[PDB]
Amino acid sequence: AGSIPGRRS
Amino acid sequence: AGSIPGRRS
Amino acid sequence: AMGSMERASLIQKAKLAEQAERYEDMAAFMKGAVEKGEELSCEERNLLSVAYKNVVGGQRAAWRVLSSIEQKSNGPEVREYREKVETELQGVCDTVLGLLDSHLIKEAGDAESRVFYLKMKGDYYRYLAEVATGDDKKRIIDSARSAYQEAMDISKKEMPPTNPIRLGLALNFSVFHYEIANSPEEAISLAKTTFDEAMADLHTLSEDSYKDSTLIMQLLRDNLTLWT
Amino acid sequence: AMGSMERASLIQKAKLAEQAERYEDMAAFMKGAVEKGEELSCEERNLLSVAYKNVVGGQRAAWRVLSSIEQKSNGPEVREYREKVETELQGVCDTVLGLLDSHLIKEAGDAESRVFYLKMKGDYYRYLAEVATGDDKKRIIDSARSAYQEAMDISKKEMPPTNPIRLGLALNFSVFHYEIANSPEEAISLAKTTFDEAMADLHTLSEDSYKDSTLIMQLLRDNLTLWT
Numbered sequence: 525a526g527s528i529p530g531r532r533s
Numbered sequence: 534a535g536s537i538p539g540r541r542s
Numbered sequence: 543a544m545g546s547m548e549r550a551s552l553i554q555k556a557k558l559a560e561q562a563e564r565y566e567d568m569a570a571f572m573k574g575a576v577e578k579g580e581e582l583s584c585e586e587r588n589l590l591s592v593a594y595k596n597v598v599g600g601q602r603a604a605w606r607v608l609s610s611i612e613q614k615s616n617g618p619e620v621r622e623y624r625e626k627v628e629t630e631l632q633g634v635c636d637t638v639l640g641l642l643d644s645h646l647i648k649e650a651g652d653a654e655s656r657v658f659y660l661k662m663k664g665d666y667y668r669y670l671a672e673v674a675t676g677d678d679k680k681r682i683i684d685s686a687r688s689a690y691q692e693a694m695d696i697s698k699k700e701m702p703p704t705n706p707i708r709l710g711l712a713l714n715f716s717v718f719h720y721e722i723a724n725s726p727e728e729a730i731s732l733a734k735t736t737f738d739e740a741m742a743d744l745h746t747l748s749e750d751s752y753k754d755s756t757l758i759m760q761l762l763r764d765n766l767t768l769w770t
Numbered sequence: 771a772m773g774s775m776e777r778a779s780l781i782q783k784a785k786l787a788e789q790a791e792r793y794e795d796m797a798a799f800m801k802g803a804v805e806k807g808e809e810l811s812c813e814e815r816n817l818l819s820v821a822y823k824n825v826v827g828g829q830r831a832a833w834r835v836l837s838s839i840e841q842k843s844n845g846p847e848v849r850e851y852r853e854k855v856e857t858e859l860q861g862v863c864d865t866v867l868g869l870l871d872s873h874l875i876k877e878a879g880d881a882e883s884r885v886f887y888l889k890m891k892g893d894y895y896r897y898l899a900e901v902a903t904g905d906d907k908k909r910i911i912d913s914a915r916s917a918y919q920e921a922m923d924i925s926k927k928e929m930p931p932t933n934p935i936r937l938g939l940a941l942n943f944s945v946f947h948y949e950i951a952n953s954p955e956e957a958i959s960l961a962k963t964t965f966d967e968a969m970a971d972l973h974t975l976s977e978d979s980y981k982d983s984t985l986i987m988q989l990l991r992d993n994l995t996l997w998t
């Protein structure tokens with residue numbers, strides 16, 4: 525399960 | 534120019 | 543440690559450290575900027591969160607490697623080194639939590655800032671819960687839950703269902719339910735309701751806002767696909 | 771810092787740190803192991819080199835990002851932060867050089883160990899030369915050259931032309947000629963002669979030794995393709 529990344533990739 | 538890596542990949 | 547450097551110089555150096563992939567430095571610059579005592583702008587809040595998420599993310603990945611080796615082994619070295627990484631991780635989480643408590647949350651009045659900081663508070667207690675086993679593991683889980691719940695209550699009152707902070711909060715709270723709280727049905731229900739309510743509000747968005755909201759909705763869908 | 775930990779525990783923890791991609795910890799464990807004062811086995815020498823090459827490699831990548839930003843800009847912040855990363859990089863190189871000088875090289879009598887440590891000495895002076903601009907940049911370049919040359923002289927007398935240490939030494943010395951010493955023709959000549967002499971000795975090798983030697987010969991070829 526993935527949580528949110530901090531930046532648009 | 535690449536130098537040597539430390540481990541076989 | 544950063545008390546003699548100007549706030550604006552700390553912010554500029556945090557941006558350079560991100561570019562150089564020096565996330566420990568980035569976190570130290572942003573800690574110094576928070577400790578100047580002024581509120582953070584939206585971009586500065588993102589710099590603070592990116593820095594610490596990268597530092598703790600690397601610690602978590604290392605802790606998981608070591609914990610797996612330790613579980614397979616069951617001398618003292620693997621446990622000792624897992625404990626060392628664990629203590630370092632806990633220290634970083636305690637540092638971030640301390641910044642939020644002194645005094646970012648109490649000064650955050652707008653919904654966008656208050657929800658962002660309470661989401662961070664939930665996330666860093668969740669990372670503490672991932673390694674907890676002692677007399678306070680239940681209490682750490684409740685602290686994460688309480689922070690996420692307050693953030694959810696404000697977000698549902700004050701932000702549209704496509705707002706990226708609202709979406710990322712819901713994503714991370716659903717991960718908390720699935721991975722920490724042993725509540726997979728609550729995780730699935732939250733992810734589905736969040737996705738559906740965002741879908742119904744996409745028509746209101748510009749092209750750039752659409753791209754941001756649909757990116758997070760895809761993460762919700764990816765989890766639902768893994769969980770169902 | 772590691773004086774109270776057993777040598778064998780430092781070695782075991784360096785191996786765990788590599789698995790966890792904790793290269794700063796790995797380097798500190800291997801520094802502690804060297805400082806026990808005993809000679810290093812082949813595998814321990816590789817642990818020491820892997821740890822520091824990863825630490826300095828990340829510093830070099832960050833220094834290059836910052837140096838590029840600084841050159842494009844030409845306030846004090848980009849230069850100040852490039853200088854901070856540069857000083858940290860120099861400190862790591864000085865630490866490794868100090869371990870080699872106190873006392874790994876002087877105790878290394880077998881060709882495999884002595885060549886390996888002198889190659890390391892050339893490499894860490896080369897990393898110092900990459901950032902040098904002052905009164906001693908010429909002197910740092912000569913120190914790298916001298917270490918690589920002594921290693922080359924021993925390797926040509928004592929090791930077959932397919933030996934992986936001999937090949938990696940020649941590869942890195944050729945990079946020194948091309949990138950540091952402004953001697954691209956010497957770099958190309960060394961890479962070509964090394965490749966050709968290894969090719970002619972491949973018939974003597976087992977399958978596993980063949981794989982190791984041909985892997986490095988491909989790196990020599992990749993550089994020759996970039997340089998010609």
Ligand SMILES: *Cc1ccc(S(=O)(=O)N2CCC[C@@H]2C)cc1
Nearest residue numbers: 528529530531532706707710754
């Ligand atoms: C928790 C959180 C953090 C950042 C964002 S964002 O800045 O709007 N962003 C970054 C990548 C995904 C999303 C679009 C949202 C929530």
Ligand SMILES: *Cc1ccc(S(=O)(=O)N2CCC[C@@H]2C)cc1
Nearest residue numbers: 537538539540541934935938982
């Ligand atoms: C300088 C150097 C370092 C390591 C080696 S190796 O251990 O024999 N190895 C690792 C990858 C390439 C090569 C096969 C050789 C030279």
Ligand SMILES: [Cl-]
Nearest residue numbers: 581649650651
């Ligand atoms: Cl306020």
Ligand SMILES: [Cl-]
Nearest residue numbers: 809877878879
């Ligand atoms: Cl000896």
Ligand SMILES: [Mg+2]
Nearest residue numbers: 624625628629
């Ligand atoms: Mg513990």
Ligand SMILES: [Mg+2]
Nearest residue numbers: 852853856857
């Ligand atoms: Mg300098």
